[PDB]
């Protein structure tokens, strides 16, 4: 996260750090005690193997995510229409081997419902352990920052992303830059508060540089993916 501030315990209780062989690689969002929403570009082969992945919840600093303190991932499911060249349909699910214990530090975020009626420039938050500057290293501490939705018509303009934003994508940030997700925030949450509920509206997908003018962040459009998410959860439960 570029241009944000370190988070307090319990501020973003759905945020998880997803490790490959005990090294942070991607972020994710808790939606049930066993299901985590992340990005498909985090889990392309050979990272489609659940054996490599562990999830760390309720911990703010990477130095406190030890071997054995994290939850082993049991299943990894990428969107069947994910396209690696364009990152279209960039969403994936991880199922934990053992359910999480919810408390003050670990809680789920709500999946969006149809008919949220969000504002064109709805105020949102992003969080993660991504770099705090372009080309920087992973952040030891969880950071978070405010961003606004940017209408896809504006994001697809010639001087922004020039028709690269599909219906499975949403844009958020600032066309002036300064605040943005960055390397290491992949898969993490883009959330918004409405009716006193925090809703998961995006997962960190791609961007051109970090916090540069007219190059805002692009996020998987979680609302579009909800039917697929429910189907995977339903197929797992029985």
């Amino acid at each position, epitope marked *: 996260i570029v241009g944000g501030e370190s988070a307090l315990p319990g501020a973003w209780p759905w945020q998880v750090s997803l490790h*490959v*062989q*005990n*090294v*942070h*690689v*991607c972020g994710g969002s808790i939606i049930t005690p066993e299901w985590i929403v992340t990005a498909a*570009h*985090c889990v*392309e*082969k*050979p*990272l489609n193997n659940p*054996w*490599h992945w562990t999830a760390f919840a309720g911990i703010l600093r990477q130095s406190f995510m030890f071997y054995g303190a994290g939850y082993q991932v049991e299943k990894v499911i990428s969107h069947p229409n994910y396209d*690696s*060249k364009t*990152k279209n349909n960039d969403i994936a699910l991880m199922k934990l081997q053992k359910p999480l214990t919810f408390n003050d530090l670990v809680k789920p975020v709500c999946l969006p419902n149809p008919g949220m009626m969000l504002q064109p420039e709805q105020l949102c938050w992003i969080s993660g352990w*991504g770099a705090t500057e372009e*080309k920087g290293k*992973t952040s030891e501490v969880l950071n978070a920052a405010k961003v606004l939705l940017i209408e896809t018509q504006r994001c697809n303009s010639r001087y922004v992303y020039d028709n690269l934003i599909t219906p499975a994508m949403i844009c958020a940030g600032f066309l002036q830059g300064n605040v943005d*997700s*960055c*390397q*290491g*925030d*992949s898969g993490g949450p883009l959330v918004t508060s409405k009716n006193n509920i925090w809703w998961l509206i995006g997962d*960190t*997908s*791609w*961007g*051109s*540089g*970090c916090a540069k003018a007219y190059r805002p962040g692009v996020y998987g459009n979680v609302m579009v993916f909800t039917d697929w998410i429910y189907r995977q959860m339903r197929a797992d439960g029985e």
Partner: nanobody
Amino acid sequence: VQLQASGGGFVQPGGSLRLSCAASGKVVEQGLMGWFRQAPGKEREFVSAIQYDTKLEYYADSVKGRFTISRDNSKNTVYLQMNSLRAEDTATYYCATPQMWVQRDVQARWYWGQGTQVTVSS
């Protein structure tokens, strides 16, 4: 973790090369090491990967059978033996860890030291 690739060169169809990736940093960061390749004007491609204890190896379909990946943990070095090379294997080959290859911005450049050029022409 710092990675220095080497071993690239020019060969003809049927030839062989053995690439090396020397790692400097905490061994915890080397749990999974991978090789990727990129030819000009084309998308980056996964090639092979190996677990630190060598008990799991991965290969892309297009190189399965011809390439072999190995480690020497006291040197902290990963090797990629490539046999029976074709012209379509021509690319710059990169070694990387998962924290490097999984990219929010895929068009962001990888460090020069991670790569080594391989050209296959007769």
